[PDB]
Amino acid sequence: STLIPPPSKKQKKEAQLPREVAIIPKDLPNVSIKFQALDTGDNALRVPGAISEKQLEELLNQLNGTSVPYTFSCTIKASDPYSSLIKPQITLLYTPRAVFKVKPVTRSSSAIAGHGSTILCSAFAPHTSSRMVTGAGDNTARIWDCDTQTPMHTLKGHYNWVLCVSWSPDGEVIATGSMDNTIRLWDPKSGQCLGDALRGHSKWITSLSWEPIHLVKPGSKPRLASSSKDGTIKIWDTVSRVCQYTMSGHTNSVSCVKWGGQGLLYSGSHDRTVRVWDINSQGRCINILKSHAHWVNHLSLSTDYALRIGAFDHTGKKPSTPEEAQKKALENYEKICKKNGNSEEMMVTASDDYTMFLWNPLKSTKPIARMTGHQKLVNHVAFSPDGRYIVSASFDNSIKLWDGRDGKFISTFRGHVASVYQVAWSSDCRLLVSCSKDTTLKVWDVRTRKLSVDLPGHKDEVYTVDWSVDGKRVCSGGKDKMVRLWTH
Amino acid sequence: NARAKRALVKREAKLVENVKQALFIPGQSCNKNLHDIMVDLSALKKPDMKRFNRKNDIHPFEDMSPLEFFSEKNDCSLMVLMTSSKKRKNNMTFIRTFGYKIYDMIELMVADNFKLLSDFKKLTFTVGLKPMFTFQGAAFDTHPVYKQIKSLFLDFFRGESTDLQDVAGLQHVISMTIQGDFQDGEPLPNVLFRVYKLK
Amino acid sequence: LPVTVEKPIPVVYDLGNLAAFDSNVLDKNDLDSSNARREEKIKSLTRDNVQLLINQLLSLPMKTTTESVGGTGGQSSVMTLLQLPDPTTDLPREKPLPKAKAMTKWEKFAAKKGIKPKERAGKMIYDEASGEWVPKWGYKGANKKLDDQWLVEVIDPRTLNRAERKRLVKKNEKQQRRNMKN
Amino acid sequence: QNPMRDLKIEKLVLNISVGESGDRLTRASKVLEQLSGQTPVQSKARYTVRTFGIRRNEKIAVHVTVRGPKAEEILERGLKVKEYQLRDRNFSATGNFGFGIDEHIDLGIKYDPSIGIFGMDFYVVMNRPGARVTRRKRCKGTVGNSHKTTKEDTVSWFKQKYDADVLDK
Amino acid sequence: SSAYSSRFQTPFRRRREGKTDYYQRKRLVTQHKAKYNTPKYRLVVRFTNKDIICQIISSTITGDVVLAAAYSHELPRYGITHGLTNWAAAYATGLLIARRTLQKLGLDEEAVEDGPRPFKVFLDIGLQRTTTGARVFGALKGASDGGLYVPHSENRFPGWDFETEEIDPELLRSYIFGGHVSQYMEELADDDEERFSELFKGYLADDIDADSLEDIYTSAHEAIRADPAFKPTEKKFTKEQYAAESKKYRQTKLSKEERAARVAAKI
RNA sequence: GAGAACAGAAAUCUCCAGUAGAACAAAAGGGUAAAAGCCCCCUUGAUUUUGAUUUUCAGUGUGAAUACAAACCAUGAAAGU
RNA sequence: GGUUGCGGCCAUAUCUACCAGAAAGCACCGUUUCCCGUCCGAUCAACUGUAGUUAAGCUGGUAAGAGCCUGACCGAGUAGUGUAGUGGGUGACCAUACGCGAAACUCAGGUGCUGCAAUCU
Fold this sequence. Notes:
Chain B is of the alpha/beta class. Chain B is built from five helices and nine strands; from the N terminus they run αβαβαββββααβββ. In chain C, β1 (12-14) and β2 form a beta hairpin.
């Protein structure tokens, strides 16, 4: 075991003396401080004393008339959120917090037996963290009782690998995609298959996307969008289980499809092209984006989190009526969408060309900004729950953070020793769990841009990781065939 | 077989010496109040607290051989002997040993105003935590007798030495204060021993 | 509410033992056993000293690891521990230094000659004419093979070999005793 | 008033000590197994007396314990072989009792000359409800003298059933 | 004999009664302790007839101090009326105590030096035997699921086979949800009815069935997760009344004057 | 000490005593207790690599032993050892 | 005040012989499908609280029971020991102080308290 060099005798002598008392008697600011909304609003050059964080929060609350805490950041150089009073017009930039705190995850629970093959995918239920479903190489899929950490309501009927598994935003239906050219819908509370398996695809399903609740008709059930390696996408109606519209604009395998909050569908394909499709216009393409040199992998949107957990929140409270659920989903979508002062959603496209592009498909067809610097292909990209930051995973063992507002690079989360497959954002946006080909999982804290804790214990490569809506539990799955649950 | 070899190695001297063990010897004249005081004081010395089985007729200033023999047999570098007499009531003699040879001895007598744990406020305490020390009075750093007292108490109550400490372990502080400054020709002021729970 | 402490003489701290020394003057009358308020003054002084000591301790740097439980010896990432410096007060040792020295009459010759210390590879040694290693010593040693073998061509020679082993062991013990005599 | 101090059988112990640890020992163990239906256990030897030729750790004896109604099923047959007539002796101070017999073939099991003739030492221990305290790992405790089994109590209990006798003291 | 008694040294009172083992207790009370100085609370779980006792206990010179406590007799508050000392009841009690202490400590719903320092506790079972599948390990599993991170291997949970070093999660779930009790009830449903009328009599009185037992256990777990408030009894006939009742039948020691008077007439 | 066919003064079993005139590596303070004793399950280690003494003949920014320290290892549910 | 759990002091807590215990809880007890281990479901593991018993455990009361413990000018500031001086004694020793400083014995008293959580007419 190689050890850090020990301190010298001079270091010991220096440390033996007292110093660094935090009396801070007066610390009267030399320059006035003003509050400005981070988004667009400037709100007033005050000259207060050594006011604490609570005092600043109270001042902002009484300015807003709520005396809703906001996180105070200095001028973005310093870029440091009395915290900033040590460095000395000064402007303090604040953003809504959406008060919540996900307890850091540092311990596992147990190693659970199950599928006799590597785990492939997982997804926590949008409404409760007590139930979760994992897809694995074994043809069967199993739902796990996250409380007791035991299998429950095993899904059977498939005859090939369960490539992808997704949970409906309403939490009433589970959609599972397998290497076989079929998709099956299952009741989470019984495991029964909802009618005959969806069929019509010529090749295995690559990804699944559920229609957002706020766009669905009041009282009706959401549709299910699916993508296949053949390059075609079908919009399946969960009621009739029949694909109303088939789209095959992509000339190669479709990497994934994302259902935007505006009703448009954005998908990446192996043809090095990104296409925007509108469900309203009888499922017809509207625009084509051509900037990636290599194929596009894992297209993502800023609103993905809200759409996934539409009508729900970290508290897990369920809606009473369909109208209330739709209203809550619309409010949740607007909260992130209207952060710019106008209804807009950002889209980030990743590709194996060592570059990622930021797009506003509705506003303009040109890329807003180009994110570059990775040494290898970017496997995974995950927008923050509020769109504040963009994080991407690459095979070069490095994870990079980019500003979600303009795509500017922020920092690189170093520490991984193997290719990073996928990452999942925390509900409060404070933490970020990540998995890599190496033997251990890792979680990063965006606030300090530093590693939070290493989570070893997996016996082989880990391909799947997800964070619960409430943030209480984190699941994972890998080549070891053992499903692991992690929580504070 | 070689089971006792590990014990001998533990008893054997090392570059970094183990935590000093405290042996409390109940004297022949030891009284019930003195025994209770000794038990209460040793409660803070756990897990390094050891109590002898039977009363011992010990005269440290007349013959130091019994103390050396007890230290050698028990491998206890720190020893406290209870003693009570008409002239010296509640005499608690502290003894240090260097290689089982008596290092220094100092007689301490507890005044009748002592208060036991039961009589104090009904608050709890954590066993095994390193106590904090606060020495009051310049005589501690200048007077040879008070310097020896300070050194003995530090070696006795400091516990195991560590370069890394937890904040949660700073539950209580042991305070020693001199009863006012003094000059030559005056009796040595009594040393006040107090333990305070931290909030 | 106040936490700052001011004294005529700065407090001398010993962070390696969590100890603080106060040389400030003390009033004999106030601390006299006959005073009813005796306890209050001592409590206030101890509170001030403990506040100063706690401030100094919290001013120290603290470790912050990113590992997990794993080996129970290491601290969890959630925990952070103050890095106490080495003790400043000198305390007597309980035993003398064990730095006893003796060449055993072997080190002297090994220094006089060019005999380098043996590499000390291991117990395992290849036992020819067999498909097993059977280490030199430690378990089922090859040295015991002569006793278990069937023909000892050229009084039982096995007893002679055992006597030779006993003689060698006794010679080693006698050499150890001779070296201890020094 | 004796609500919960009725004398009852604790366990039946069958032992067969033999002068050697070979064919006879194995055959006696087989006899015990086929009688009680349970595998017996072999008792070691503490010292080499050398008077009878026994050596240390020779595994000289075998015994097996029987409990419940199965124990009574064998005790009644053994007493029938003994004609339900014990002596004032054969009872322990603490209320235990036992006897012995020869030609075990008389009590049921056929001769089977391949197995041979054997006897069996019949020993019985008596207790009362609450004896679990004496053997329970947690909070082990003694038993009051008013509850301890005694020779007279064991004899009285024996008289109550089997129409046995207390033949001359 | 007098000499035997004089030389005889009585063991510790807490050890004379077969309740505490000082050999094992020493390791928990005084750990290695040369490592980082941190408090180490002990989760004491004890099983008695008709009841289960679980307590989080610290260490102090004056004696152990309990921070939180739970008992199986509070389970009926959550709807569990039978098998208070069974495996499922032990799991429920462990989960209840863990969640209760977590809520009381502020982890859900000198705090300097973030983070929150989750509450780690070491299980103590006293003289209870270490056997795989014991309901004590069930209480351990319940506490672990409740948020108390007791370091423990799965070598003793029910369903742990020795042929293969793998825990059977289905058997563990069945034991947690009272699957064994339901299986026994189903077996008795076609066996002798006298035992079925004596055993599970409370179940028949409450109209319990195989699946209803699991449903009741799940509802009790949900209620435990919902209401750990720990509301005690109203305590009718308050402490002074109980003291008077006890003193009514209590036998007082005879004074030395009474002894002398009795002896004067005896002689 | 009370009882058991051979079986007695010594064979093995059941019960009540045993401060320990158990075997404890130790003499020995007189110590060792739901053990440092007895019965049973798993287990290699002369593992490497950093630092201060020793040696030399491509003085080997390492080739080795010694001491310390850190990883690793055995066990248990665990504290811990 | 009784009681269960965890403990501190570790015989005023122990040992022998006698007697009671309203309610609750310990305790015995009832069962071997499951987890579990034994020659034996005796021990232990699990189920049952249902068919009972306060017989036993445990708590409490008694013996001028055995031991044990405490305060003490009772021994006692005594014995013992130590250091000093032409004080007497040729010296050794005798008388004094001058500092430590006992114990048997004896007088009188006693035969469990107490820390935290929970429960009971």
